[model samples]
Target: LYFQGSTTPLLANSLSVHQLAAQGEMLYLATRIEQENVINHTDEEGFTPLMWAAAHGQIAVVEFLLQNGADPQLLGKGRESALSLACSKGYTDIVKMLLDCGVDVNEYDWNGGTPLLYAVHGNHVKCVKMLLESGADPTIETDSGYNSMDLAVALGYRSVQQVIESHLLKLLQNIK
Candidate 1:
């Protein structure tokens, strides 16, 4: 599945630096860019390579760029952030990597959605737990005022819903 082409094709040269990261790993890109510097290369709606890689859930591409000084704090043109975008698709590896950095766990996007909201929306059980452990505020609401628990329960995510409840249970018990 690495190099297989279904209908069209994907090559290093064809995709822009940002899109390339979202598509696949970039050792060829490494060689080409070693002669230059574009780890933070902005392309296609003011997005950097890191955001694209995190958005798509490819660890190697993200790890490669992180060492190159890729910035997780950068925002896309639409105000979409790396954490929220990765969380939107439920990429736990990407979420963990971004969380390892000082990247904001409760970062809000253009739609007033935070990383936790998107994680619950996708039913990312591990991500929901991880975000809460990382101090993400589950009480943080969406634009219309739906909390992570509200979204999880509405979305019918049994494990995700219980994760939120059990998490709050621990908090309430800690007070005792």
Candidate 2:
């Protein structure tokens, strides 16, 4: 349950959030495999089993849940949305899928941090592009007064920086 430096709790049994994300649901799909009963479950930390799955880049399970109507915008107690989690973890395809499912691209966390900013911080160029192209406001700043481009530039995500900077320029042009 710690996003800190190591020593995190198991998100579910032996599978940490990151591992569940990378391994997908094959472990749960295998009826013959006698593992723990933690499929589609969440811990007390408000991290859904799917959050771990998608954060680790479990594309199949992510797609499955999205198609099954899992709320892409569901926020944890920390106000972390599923889309934000995916962006922070650099799950580009999952970000696309969630966006395609009509999840709000401009949805912010409690700190007014957008998914675009998270993608920028995580150095996910593709996700930054997708979000900006989908109308995520590059001008919208976080509570700390950092916009998407600002975060991208500070994090040295050059590709994302270019995208967000371009988007900001486009917005300025439209206003003119």
* Model 2 residue 107 CA deviation in Å: 2.6
TM-scores, one per candidate:
0.85, 0.71
Candidate 2: the clashing residue pairs are none
List the candidate 2 regions with Cα displacement exceeding 4 Å.
1-23, 27-42, 172-176
Per-residue lDDT of candidate 1, residues 50-138 (tens digit): 88888888788888888778888888877888788888898888888888887878767778888899899899888888999999999
Tens-digit per-residue lDDT, 1-176, candidate 2 = 35655553333335553355447645433321235444444567677656766777788877765554455666667777778888888788888887887877777677677788888877888888888888788878888888877887776778887787677777654554
lDDT (C-alpha, whole model) for all candidates: 0.82, 0.70
Measured by C-alpha RMSD in angstroms, how accurate is candidate 2? Answer: 7.7
Off by over 4 Å in 1: 1-11, 172-176
